[PDB]
Amino acid sequence: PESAKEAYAWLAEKGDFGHFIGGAWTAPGDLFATVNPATGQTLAQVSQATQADVDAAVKAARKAQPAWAKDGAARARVLYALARLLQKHARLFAVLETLDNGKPIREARDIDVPLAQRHFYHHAGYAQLMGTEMPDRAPLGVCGQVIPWNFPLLMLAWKIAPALAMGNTVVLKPAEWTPLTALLFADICGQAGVPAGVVNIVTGDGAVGEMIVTAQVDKVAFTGSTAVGRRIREATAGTGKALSLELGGKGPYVVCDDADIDSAVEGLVDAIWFNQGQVCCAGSRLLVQEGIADVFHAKLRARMDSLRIGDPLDKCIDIGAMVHPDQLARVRDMVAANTDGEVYQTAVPAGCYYPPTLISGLAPASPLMQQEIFGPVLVSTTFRTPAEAVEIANNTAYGLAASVWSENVNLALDLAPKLVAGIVWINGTNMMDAAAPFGGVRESGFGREGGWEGLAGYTRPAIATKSPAAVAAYTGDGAADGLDRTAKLYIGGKQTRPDGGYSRAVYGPKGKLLGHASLSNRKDLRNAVEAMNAASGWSRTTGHLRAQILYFIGENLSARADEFANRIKDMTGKDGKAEVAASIDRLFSAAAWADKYDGQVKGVPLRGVALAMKEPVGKIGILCPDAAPLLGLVSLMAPAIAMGNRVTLAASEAFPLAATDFYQVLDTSDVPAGVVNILTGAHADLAEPMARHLDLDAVWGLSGHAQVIEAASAGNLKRSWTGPFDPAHDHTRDILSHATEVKTIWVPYG
Amino acid sequence: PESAKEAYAWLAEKGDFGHFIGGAWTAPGDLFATVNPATGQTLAQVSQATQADVDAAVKAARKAQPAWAKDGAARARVLYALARLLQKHARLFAVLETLDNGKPIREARDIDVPLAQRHFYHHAGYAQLMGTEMPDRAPLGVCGQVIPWNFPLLMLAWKIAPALAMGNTVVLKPAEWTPLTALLFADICGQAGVPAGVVNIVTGDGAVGEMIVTAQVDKVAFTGSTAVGRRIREATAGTGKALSLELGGKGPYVVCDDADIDSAVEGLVDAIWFNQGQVCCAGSRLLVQEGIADVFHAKLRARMDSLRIGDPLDKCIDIGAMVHPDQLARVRDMVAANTDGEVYQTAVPAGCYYPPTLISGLAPASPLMQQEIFGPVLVSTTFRTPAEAVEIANNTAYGLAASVWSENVNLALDLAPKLVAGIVWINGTNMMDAAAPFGGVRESGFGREGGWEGLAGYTRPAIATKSPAAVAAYTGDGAADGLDRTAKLYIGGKQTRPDGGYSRAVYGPKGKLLGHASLSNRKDLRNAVEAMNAASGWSRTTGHLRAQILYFIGENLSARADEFANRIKDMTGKDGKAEVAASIDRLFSAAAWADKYDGQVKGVPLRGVALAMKEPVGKIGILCPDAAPLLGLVSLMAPAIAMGNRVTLAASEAFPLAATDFYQVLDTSDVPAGVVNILTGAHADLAEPMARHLDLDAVWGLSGHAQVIEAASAGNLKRSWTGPFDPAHDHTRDILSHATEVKTIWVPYG
């Protein structure tokens, strides 16, 4: 096997570890053994950080950030130097990864370390280009980062490289069980020219992670369990921190009747060790078409038998040691709790070694197909038609990566966009490149890592905007209205009474009664969500169709421009002509964009190309500001539906009658039913129900309630945006990003 | 058949036609009948424009342009109004197209008019977004445009829509044989709100086209024969006009053994009428794998028999009238001159009707496979392996569109990037959309029409740059050099003596002898081109590899930074440190870009998606300015090779010794042989040979000689760029566009 002598020498040199703060190593503190899981031997003593340590790390990261942000070319040289040092010390990083985590040295040397190198090489260029190619963007500041134990060095690269490229500084904590390659990374920062405090590494358990998440940082980036991601969303709610989450979701692996069987089998067995912890991967949930399922399973079991289990330092080993006894117990207990299907294992579990395991013959609706999967374990079911495969694949709370196998050029490219996922690999699995973004939808989280697409989440606008202050509704005497001037709601292509039956009088600036506006409730929202569900076909329309609709809305608003200006003036006391003209312009800009927001083709040094496609988010609940009674609604609605989303807007609480006049515009413009729904009333009644709703994909709260909205969003981990949003400013291009998901499809290409 | 009554009424209303100039119709002038080719009847009298008319049209276009350029949102409303009027009058446009050109009314109604509408609908949005999404760009000014007879209305849309979107005005001449839909287009401009003079239509023969090409316009855009494109390149040489050319090249149609045979057959027969004149198309050159060739041909001949020939006003007709007796004679003579293969025709030629014709059994090296093809005629050959198919497909002077048929997901996507073409359709042909760019390489021309990609050619930089003035070499006494200080050339990875044997003394600003520099000749250039041919593998490398090489060049220049600054100062008398630092920065910016210049995915309202990929231009000859002895060379070389090109640079004529010091940098950085070649000497000796060379794909002349360079480039219609180029300015992103071709691959997608 491979010599660990240089790794042991480094560990003996470093002695008991403190933390890497402000460019220097601190004294060892409250120490705990970190253990080689394959031998049980102590590798080093590592500290449990204190609150004082985290405070110090964030303070050092903050002190260093403005000088670091100033010169992108200088950052590029440092990122390049880090990649060169990962390459020069590649064998040391690889052995230390194996010693610390248990994975086969062949994977650490062939996969982990080369992809970490490439991540830094590639992201060096983004630092070089940031000033000129991203001129409207600026660094966020300090990033708190938390990563899991399955790919310790590679997870670190995925966090630190883009953060540094965009001029941020970092405080990162490796997983409690696997601190060593992060500590070696810290130890090479000086030689790479990382200025003191630009990188800070602290070690500890989940409590230390929580200290970082709640520290005075500008961004939290986390990879790990869905449950911890929910807690992080709750703990950061209302703080204005940027947040990205790469969570659970071991992916489906779809094998069609006309797949290259032997290649599909080999790709699955070669992924059994890889597909552990929270990582973008596919293979753990096997879906095989029923005509080939028996032959596929028979070939799979025999190929699983050829996997070699043993000493992870042996370059011929395929299945290493489980990372920790806690993880071994997890897998053991998962298998003990299952009574479904037929379990095949290639060897008897022994010591730290758990064998490749296949549980086949499950039903599509079986629970184990949908529950979290631990260890080197595959579960399989069959399907009859490609449509049933899609249905099974999408029948979970997750959506991260997926793999599709078919030799037919139509079938593979017709199934891939139907899978709910951030990544789809055609005729491969677990393909990764620094230029190709990856990340989740649904309960697999949000944000993307890698590529140009990954950079937005480590930046903010160069010029800050500020949301307008709330505006209290005007009051009035309370005299009855002898005319019929009570506005309704707009749900599912028709006007509807508020379920609660109440409406409030609306008064002008001097107390004149203007009319009445409905007070919507949670049942109204529920009806609007059902209407958006019935309008799912809108998310499959062509860009050309959606543009035509938005052009009609703009033209039909123009035809009533003076009427809308008069309504705005009635309500606010201020001339409305400029706001109406801006609203028309936002509609024509969204119409313009509807068929022009292009996906991006990534050249990769692997087989083929990666297509970073733009897709709708789905169903979006939106709360509009008081100010800009028309423009605020139109500015949020138009880019959203341009991108293929369906929306439910809570109009301006103070000034609802421009939105209700807008119902006729939507009707005259043939907006399909359910695509635009409008509620009026008190946002205190609606904000938490919209943010909580388990059947909304995103909530945009631009009228306040940010803490309540962001905390309630953790229920299904919907995307959330709470501003800033200034309707006077044209935010169209930025809202397009809020309104879309990136889905990266890896296809063959000569 | 379809009623022509409304079309005849319009023609009777318009009477004898003058031209549409300055928003108004001019008096009829020197009149000639335009004739219905299916009936021989005169449709209308149409004028042959005078030089006075063209002058007036350009003067009106110029007068209107600045107001038109000012408000992009206003232009978007006009472009949208034009699309609505094309849609409202769709049936009139379609019948008039059939009457004037001879094509079946079903094609005019189903294909021509709907795509013209969509082109205007879609490009309206680019006008709306131009200010904010293209802030560094501004209108060119006035565009002279010339279009052919095969798709009169659609060709007009492809020219006028992007020109107007980007704030230009137009003078367009329809084909002599088919003026009528352009005249109806003129007649609807008023109703659409086109400001007077923004659109000008003049009619006439090729002499009128030549008047427009040589008029005081900022841009010439032409679609037509390759021979006329050469003449247009010669007549515009040295004028500073922008130029785009969509030329000949009926495309290859590759049918693999595992193609969907019946679909491939049906796509070919449905394209027989379409594939006429100079248009982006495929089907005319059929390449069928030998295992299925007999069955394919047998099915093809019978499907050809089902095509209905006759009255083009009959909606059941598939094969209409030939456009003009001159075109009928062309096809007849082409068939009479051929002695190869086996000719099958579905009917006897009669009157204006020529039957679908298949000439099969040709050899791959047969001439008719490579000669221009006229009429509804297909020619076919067979191939054995996919590699032979590529070889046959690429064995012409053209490169426009191509089609590939295979049910295998690997094969189709592995063949498409190997075909020399601007457009490749997988399992389809002649697929068109306003968002998907199309255009040629090689002798099929240059520039792209459609999409974001088509807009650059109708704009220029918002801030103009200016090339530095030439600098005379310093002189000196003429004393012999007792040390060995004679620099060589750098060709094919090694230093080489100039073939001519001569070198000139190089002197500093005060007459000190600094050394000697070789005087390169045409044989040296020939050797450099052969070296670039041997380095063709560089154009197939990964972006990651090319980045690594460029990073090495930058680091190795940095290691000699003071030495290069001293050399620059020796030669120019001015401190060189800032120029060296800029040169290093250009190398690191090109390294950054090497794996980040992404292709664009187009959503189309047709089957699938269009991938607008970035590809290398190939081999580029570059002449550097006198000024910036190092920076000018490095600034041009680095983005070029970053994009996968191989280059031969003529270094600064006045100050060659920094480029010759750079040879060691290229050697130390492991630049593969032939990828960078450097010539020194007199650009009067090299400019015309580089621009003429039939084995260079592009010539960049940034030291003058623009007229000679641009005229000689017409030999093989290589791309050319003659500036402006200011080395003090960072042009990197712009040079990336000079250094790449767009290739649009249409793939299935769910």
CB spacing of B545 vs A605 below 8 angstroms? yes
Q: Spot the catalytic one: B246, B579, B615, B688.
A: B246
To the question of domain B486-747 being in CATH 2.30.30.110, the answer is no
Pairing of strands A609-616, A494-496: unpaired
Instruction: Tell me the chain A residues in contact with residue B551 when contact means C-beta distances shorter than 8 Å.
Output: 80
Give whole-number Cα distances, A452 to A422, A466, B588, in Å: 15, 26, 18
Give whole-number Cα distances, A637 to A346, A451, A650, A675, A722, in Å: 56, 29, 11, 10, 15
CA B259 to mean position of chain CA atoms: 31
Contacts with A, B 441-460, CB within 8 Å: 452
| CB atoms closer than 10 angstroms to residue A523 | 12
Instruction: Tell me the chain A residues in contact with residue B599 when contact means C-beta distances shorter than 8 Å.
Output: 600-601, 609
Q: Which of A509, A498, A499, A447 is nearest to A475 (CA)?
A: A509
Stated as kind and residue range, the H or E segment containing B300 is helix B293-305
CB-based contact B373:B334 (threshold 8 Å): yes
**B153 contacts chain A (CB < 8 A):** no
Query: Tokens standing for B682?
Result: 């007199």
Contacts with A, B 52-111, CB within 8 Å: 73, 76-77, 80
Contacts with A, B 504-563, CB within 8 Å: 542-545, 547-548, 551
CB-based contact A736:A546 (threshold 8 Å): no
Residue A358, beta-bridge partner list: A344, A378
The set of residues, in sequence order, having a beta carbon less than 8 Å from that of B350 and lying 6+ positions away, is none
Query: Tokens standing for B84?
Result: 């609505």
Stated as kind and residue range, the H or E segment containing A577 is helix A577-593
CA distance B595 to chain A (A): 7
Residue with tokens 């922008």: B242
Nearest by CB to residue B410, choosing from A415, A416, A748, is A748
Interface test with B, best of A595, A607, A740 (most B CBs within 10 A): A595
Contacts with A, B 387-426, CB within 8 Å: 406-410, 412-418, 426
Give whole-number Cα distances, A103 to A4, A219, A314, A356, in Å: 14, 31, 10, 14
CA B207 to mean position of chain CA atoms: 23
Report the alpha-carbon distance of residue A467 to residue B715 in Å, rounded. Answer: 61
CB-based contact B36:B99 (threshold 8 Å): yes
In chain A, count H helices and then E strands.
24, 31
Q: Which of A477, A485, A474, A494 is nearest to A517 (CA)?
A: A485
CB-based contact B362:B368 (threshold 8 Å): yes
Nearest by CB to residue A128, choosing from B417, B589, B600, is B589
Contacts with A, B 708-747, CB within 8 Å: 730, 733, 747
B692 in a labelled binding site = no
Report the alpha-carbon distance of residue A518 to residue A500 in Å, rounded. Answer: 9
Query: Tokens standing for B274?
Result: 């379409």
Report the alpha-carbon distance of residue B20 to residue B202 in Å, rounded. Answer: 6
Q: What is the DSSP track for B168-185?
A: -EEEEE--TT--HHHHHH
Report the alpha-carbon distance of residue A156 to residue A147 in Å, rounded. Answer: 7
Helices A180-192 and A152-165 cross at an angle (nearest 10°) of 40
Report the alpha-carbon distance of residue A710 to residue A371 in Å, rounded. Answer: 26
φ, ψ for residue A139, nearest 5 deg: -55, 150
Instruction: Tell me the chain A residues in contact with residue B125 when contact means C-beta distances shorter than 8 Å.
Output: 547, 591-596
Q: Which of A200, A204, A206, A232 is nearest to A219 (CA)?
A: A232
Residue with tokens 């891939």: A416
| CB atoms closer than 10 angstroms to residue A688 | 18
CA B212 to mean position of chain CA atoms: 20
Report the alpha-carbon distance of residue B330 to residue B225 in Å, rounded. Answer: 14
CB-based contact A666:A490 (threshold 8 Å): yes
B225 in a labelled binding site = yes
Report the alpha-carbon distance of residue A40 to residue A35 in Å, rounded. Answer: 6
Instruction: Tell me the chain A residues in contact with residue B122 when contact means C-beta distances shorter than 8 Å.
Output: 544, 547, 595
Return the amino acid letter for A82: L
Stated as kind and residue range, the H or E segment containing A65 is helix A51-70
Instruction: Tell me the chain A residues in contact with residue B590 when contact means C-beta distances shorter than 8 Å.
Output: none
Nearest by CB to residue A417, choosing from B407, B545, B749, is B749
**B611 contacts chain A (CB < 8 A):** yes
Grouping H, G, I as helix, E, B as strand and the rest as coil, residue A613 is strand
CA distance B673 to chain A (A): 22
CA-nearest residue to B548 within chain A is A121
Please report the sign of the dihedral spanned by the C-alpha atoms of residue A444, residue A125, residue B539, residue B245.
positive
Instruction: Tell me the chain B residues in contact with residue A547 when contact means C-beta distances shorter than 8 Å.
Output: 121-122, 125
Q: Spot the catalytic one: B143, B189, B256, B280.
A: B280
CB-based contact B242:B219 (threshold 8 Å): yes
Report the alpha-carbon distance of residue B536 to residue B645 in Å, rounded. Answer: 9
CATH of domain B4-248+454-461: 3.40.605.10
Report the alpha-carbon distance of residue B580 to residue B562 in Å, rounded. Answer: 8
The set of residues, in sequence order, having a beta carbon less than 8 Å from that of B181 and lying 6+ positions away, is B93, B96, B97, B100, B152, B153, B156, B174
Cβ-based burial of B3 (10 A; exposed 0-12, middle 13-18, buried ≥19) = exposed
CB-based contact A140:A459 (threshold 8 Å): yes
Residue with tokens 């664009």: B600
Return the amino acid letter for A638: A
The set of residues, in sequence order, having a beta carbon less than 8 Å from that of B32 and lying 6+ positions away, is B45, B46, B47, B48
CB spacing of B749 vs A414 below 8 angstroms? yes
Instruction: Tell me the chain A residues in contact with residue B614 when contact means C-beta distances shorter than 8 Å.
Output: 601
Helices B51-70 and B206-213 cross at an angle (nearest 10°) of 50
Report the alpha-carbon distance of residue A242 to residue B257 in Å, rounded. Answer: 54
Nearest by CB to residue A406, choosing from B409, B413, B585, is B409
CA-nearest residue to B584 within chain A is A73
Nearest by CB to residue A588, choosing from B128, B415, B591, is B128
φ, ψ for residue B260, nearest 5 deg: -65, 95
Nearest by CB to residue B613, choosing from A413, A601, A613, is A601
What residues of A are designated binding site for NAD(+)?
147, 149, 173, 176, 210, 225, 278
| CB atoms closer than 10 angstroms to residue A301 | 17
CB spacing of B414 vs A591 below 8 angstroms? no
CB spacing of B600 vs A595 below 8 angstroms? no
φ, ψ for residue A135, nearest 5 deg: -65, -25
Q: What is the DSSP track for A75-122?
A: HHHHHHHHHHHHHHTHHHHHHHHHHHH---HHHIIIIIHHHHHHHHHH
Report the alpha-carbon distance of residue B375 to residue B357 in Å, rounded. Answer: 9
Q: Which of B545, B445, B543, B449 is nearest to B245 (CA)?
A: B445
Report the alpha-carbon distance of residue A83 to residue A57 in Å, rounded. Answer: 24
Q: Which of A742, A658, A648 is nearest to A698 (CA)?
A: A648
Grouping H, G, I as helix, E, B as strand and the rest as coil, residue B377 is strand
Give whole-number Cα distances, A570 to A74, A664, B80, in Å: 57, 19, 33
CA distance A507 to chain B (A): 36
3-state SS, A219-249, equals EEEEECCHHHHHHHHHHHCCCCCEEEEECCC
Strands (E), B122-198: 137-139, 142-146, 169-173
CB spacing of A595 vs B601 below 8 angstroms? no
A&B contacts, CB < 8 Å: 182
